[PDB]
């Protein structure tokens with residue numbers, strides 16, 4: 407499913423991401439726009455052989471199992487296919503583990519390069535939250 411901007415902001419707020427580890431809701435909406443264009447079914451393969459899955463492009467070397475990433479760790483305890491669901495619960499629960507890992511939202515390259523330090527409140531402007 408391809409979310410609208412405000413529909414996803416509302417879904418993230420309901421699942422407890424607003425201000426999670428100090429990151430306001432606009433940071434999570436901005437990271438989803440540039441990682442996946444708000445599409446839960448987005449996949450992209452990396453040069454190391456790992457693949458990124460879903461709305462927040464969570465990687466199979468560390469976080470989920472896809473059966474084709476040798477020596478990888480499955481820290482979230484989920485098949486990577488669960489991250490492609492229309493229901494974002496598994497992606498949000500695993501994103502909370504990633505953002506707590508020490509480097510905060512700098513784990514998301516698109517957030518560091520396109521959201522960090524910008525007016526991220528713009529991403530939630532106009533929405534009924």
Ligand SMILES: [Cl-]
Pocket residue numbers: 515516519520
């Ligand atoms: Cl980037």
